[PDB]
Symmetry: C3
Subunit: 510 residues, 3 copies
């Protein structure tokens, strides 16, 4: 039961960018990235304004009476344990992203500084990175993750993003001009969003290899590294099961090694001192950073935001469908309040520690003179931070392998989700159609890395913002659909009608 109504237009746009970028109209793709700077100028306020709205909206709901509502049958107990649920939360907290920017981002802000602040500022350097990897991102994943976890568990609808727009569009009739389109953009936004992490994984590994087999052009090398792990996703999907479960555990171990290694070896105390700093400062500059637009100070932030804030915002939106589908399944029959409150606190905890370790020591070195700053190369900075520590050559390989495993897990999980959306929300997607999207995502992966050539990272970040632009309004509209569904929920109505009886009972007696 393959819904080709979504598959066709999806692959059409997917393969389009692939061919229109990999070759022929190569320089034309980089022209679209230039005309893309227009969306940052126009819909710039959109990503920023609503970007914070997601945080307030998801907190208001969690705090309101809707929080008591169970995600499924009335008064249903969660399947997985409380601790087990939190453990699966860390699995989502770790990704190729933290491996990439985790060490560079906090450093680039300490060296260059952020719009409206002095340079060499530890406090602001952390508050910014925190502002990009904590509440805001997960506030978007919670909205989507809740929109699904409610419509498919509580109401009992199909596992399609369109099924969440039932209240708005039309009950069951949401399969015309919209609905299908929502499911179409859902896949397109996901394939590009995942292609980003996969692409970042390539440059990350490539720069890691340029720190082992020194040296080689490395143009073909990129195509190699990609297909290497791209081919080993099949033997971890079809012929072999339990791939996501096993590899995820291995990832947590390797990620724990790097985190601990840098922690004990590097400036331990300094890292620990950053825990209260990054956290406290984050709460201080929150609204100041939330009000940061291309008008402060004097339209100077425009360039900065477009390559940082605006980027992440779009990158999370394009990734919301995947993370949403994930958090939904993990939170079976779990209170809305504990679901939201658990999605914003647990993951945000990992991002805090991770950045305080890598992005922390990287700053400590910048202070002591041993600048890890690899002449700009963001990918070479993670390994540079390792080689600067006793046993760096070793951990450098471990971190490199961890990337290869992430590339597989990320692509695997993202594929099982995309395949589901292509099968009318079938929970048990075929390991064949799943692998199909696997190469389809990696295809767009290299296409973005080759079109940019030397500026692969520049073009990669750009294309991401493109596919996310349309899906942005989807999440904004998904915000209303989630409000109407709740306002028409059994427990909710039963509450307002029971409260109206209590406010009328002691009224007549008076």
């Amino acid at each position: 039961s393959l819904n080709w109504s979504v598959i066709v237009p999806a692959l059409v746009i997917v393969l389009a960018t692939v061919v229109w970028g990999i070759g022929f109209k190569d320089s034309f793709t980089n022209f679209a990235s230039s005309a893309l700077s227009a969306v940052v100028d126009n819909l710039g306020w959109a990503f920023i304004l609503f970007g914070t709205v997601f945080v307030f909206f998801i907190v208001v709901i969690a705090a309101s009476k809707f929080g008591t509502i169970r995600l499924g049958r009335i008064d249903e107990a969660p399947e997985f344990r409380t601790v087990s649920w939190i453990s699966m939360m860390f699995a989502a907290g770790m990704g190729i992203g933290l491996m990439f920017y985790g060490t560079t981002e906090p450093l680039t802000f300490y060296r260059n500084g952020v719009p409206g602040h002095d340079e060499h500022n530890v406090g602001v350097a952390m508050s910014t990175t925190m502002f990009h990897w904590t509440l805001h991102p997960w506030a978007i994943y919670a909205i989507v993750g809740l929109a699904i976890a409610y419509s498919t568990f509580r109401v009992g609808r199909k596992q399609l993003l369109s099924s969440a727009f039932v209240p708005l569009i039309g009950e069951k009739g949401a399969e015309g001009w919209l609905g299908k389109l929502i499911d179409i953009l859902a896949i397109i936004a996901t394939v590009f969003g995942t292609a980003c992490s996969l692409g970042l994984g390539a440059l990350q590994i490539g720069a890691g290899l340029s720190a082992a087999n020194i040296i080689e052009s490395d143009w073909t090398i990129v195509g190699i590294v990609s297909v290497l792990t791209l081919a080993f996703i099949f033997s971890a999907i079809s012929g072999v099961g339990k791939g996501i479960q096993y590899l995820s555990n291995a990832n947590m171990v390797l990620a724990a090694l790097l985190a601990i290694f840098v922690f004990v070896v590097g400036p331990t105390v300094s890292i620990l001192n950053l825990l209260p700093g990054s956290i406290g400062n984050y709460l201080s500059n929150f609204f100041q950073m939330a009000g940061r637009t291309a008008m402060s100070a004097d339209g100077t932030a425009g360039e900065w935001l477009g390559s940082w804030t605006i980027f992440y915002w779009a990158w999370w939106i394009s990734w919301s469908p995947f993370v949403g589908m994930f958090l939904a399944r993990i939170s079976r029959g779990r209170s809305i309040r504990e679901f939201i409150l658990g999605v914003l606190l647990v993951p945000a905890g990992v991002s805090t520690v991770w950045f305080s370790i890598f992005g922390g020591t990287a700053i400590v070195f910048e202070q002591n003179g041993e600048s890890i700053w690899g002449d700009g190369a963001a990918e070479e900075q993670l390994f540079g931070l390792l080689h600067a520590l006793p046993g760096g050559q070793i951990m450098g390989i471990i971190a490199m392998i961890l990337l290869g495993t992430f590339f597989i897990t990320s692509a695997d999980s993202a594929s099982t989700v995309m395949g589901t959306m292509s099968q009318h929300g079938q929970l048990e997607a075929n390991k064949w159609v799943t692998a199909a999207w696997g190469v389809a995502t990696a295809a767009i992966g290299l296409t973005l890395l080759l079109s940019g050539g030397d500026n692969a990272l520049s073009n990669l970040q750009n294309v991401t913002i493109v596919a996310a632009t349309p899906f942005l309004f989807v999440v904004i509209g998904l915000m209303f659909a989630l409000v109407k569904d709740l306002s028409n929920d059994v427990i909710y109505l039963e509450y307002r009608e029971q409260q109206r009886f209590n406010a009328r009972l002691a009224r007549e007696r008076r």
Copy 2:
């Protein structure tokens, strides 16, 4: 049934300042404005400290159990629709004030800067203006608006500010040393508060005319512009009814034209980018600006505050009686929570957009070189912002007419309120006594504009702070009376006594 006990002392003080200012002791009036700088030094902390207290106090009540209480009969449904109620909220959001400072204020802060911050700072420039036209002002209007809407709807007392002090002063016995005095100051504070907006409307129009009939002295011109609309308030009160209803609708349209025109024509994107900025930054610098006193940094803010923060604070207080009487009638039998939460959110929404458009583009031009800064003239800056845009000469006239309509609506509405306070809270005041206060307010209007002459704006802002000083403590005390009334409501009071 005219309560002359309040009328006499009111007109006595009103006409006093009129004559003692319009002529004879002219230079003596400007001497009182100098000795007025003493109230900014002494009671300076009062306006600032409590100024924020109003915000916390009105939010705590709205959040507390008192919020569930209906403004009238137990479990009574509001008269007007939810959307209709919000629409009437915008009618109060729009005024002569936004037309005046809406374009200049955000600019003067971007050019000169605020105490304790660098200049040419967009973020701080917005946070400040927001700090003056959002929560704080309406937190004062909500307290008064609720004090009335409760005492006259719930309890069922007369529509007099003194009737709200029943819990404190004395039940029904609040008509001696106090009560009447509270009603006296209520009118005096209102007539001066309204005279400010009317005065600002004059200078605004006058500067608009100096951009059409260029040129003429303009001394008599001011007296003309005023009496022109001052005489057409009668034909919109007595001989003609539905004045407030019709004109209010026309005001919203014209105000929508200016707002949209500048929005689409000017830097659209920039304006939109200021929505998250002004809002976000406002929440960031809130407590920092709330703690801003004449001691930071190093008693340097004293001069700045006295001509900005301290000013608005007094200007809102002197206007609280009017806005309070208004919001009360509009919110018939409406939950206290939705009343407060609706008074702080709806109007504050307009002020955000309005300042992000006019005060926004004005900054965008300041950045691009086309400084609209009309050599200091605040009134000439609004029109300068228009003439800088395609079709400015047209909108300049539209905005000018909109001011004339505001001058009438503001004076009309303010009069119907003052007349009510002079008739033992009679909801249906006479269209004759109403028009009486009409000229009485405009009288003080010109008196403040002529006494200053060239510094008409300087003297106008000053006299305002004077009449508000006494009423300040009234609102502070009105804060306690609103707490006792609520703590002694219906089911709540009886429940405590039954537990005693």
Copy 3:
């Protein structure tokens, strides 16, 4: 019934530091203060991170359902009146501390400035002092004060800090590797914490005398001033009762005189203008100061924090046992919510006014040129602020006497608490064992002032951070024990079970309606098909 199990190890460590500091290994004591800078480097984040946690934790509990719980018998009415309870709250708000730093602290921040800010900044100068004497300190006193006031009133256990760890350690079995140790550290942390205030009282008075009998070496003078009030604590404990009650009232009067005097005489308006400033600014820089560590800006704050933030934090922790025992008795059968909400608001109100008056005028003078800055001497700055005002020579003596009374009240109250912990939580401690700890505390008092010599203040602040380090984790663990006790309360456990049954009953009733509408629906489909 003296619990020597705690007394012995306590006096052993107490007398140890006394002898090992007063003489012989004198320079060795100052060596421990150098190796002490290591705890500020290592556990530095601990004091800062959790330091704010205490604030959030104590606010969450007060806001939660636990707040409705009464501190004693179910639905028990408080003994003292609401106003009387607030009055006894001010008695705790006033101390030797405010007399010492109240005038200097806000000044040193206006002159030198704080890490990450410009100098001569009034706003930041107040926010910092506020950050040290408001929520944070009392958030620690509330946690301890509640841990006791609940375990001894509600549950009905002995008045020992160890009795509060019953949930964690073991029910009644908390008297082995732990428990006793918790009671041991409780006294040690208290004796050192009190010794600080007593020591500060000495230097304060000594500098006051150097402003009257000008002049004299003053080395022996310190030993005199101390023993003078140290000997008059006995005649105010044994031979005379009602000492704490009477003197406390006298302290409030004298403290009111100084506060008002400086208020009316000095820059009145300026002080009043600081009320909104200090308060407002405090809320603004709260999280910014809460995130202040030895990494901002660029590990430069390390030195500053170690001599300010880190100090107070440890000083409050080492004093938590005493203040906790106090607030507990004062809040008999009083709602947890009104207890916490009353401990964080009332005292924080005094600290705001006190600093806005003394620390306020001191800045006003610094602005007008008449710098009260007594060439660094912190003790000579309070009197300098007085002598600068009409009738300073008079108030200088009054403030000096007020210090002597505080020295007695502080030592007296601290002793009655330490003695209680040495008698299995006996509420009625002996006036003999109480006086015993009196000299025991003053002993460590002079020991810290003589070991430093010229840098008496430097060494005094250091030794304090030492004894508090271990007790820090005790308060962190006491945070968990307070959560388990509450989660297992009668009124509480009834509230949850009730909230469940009420949700199951409604659950059942709803299911029956869905089958009702479904049965009734398909029924009308047969009436229309067969009409």
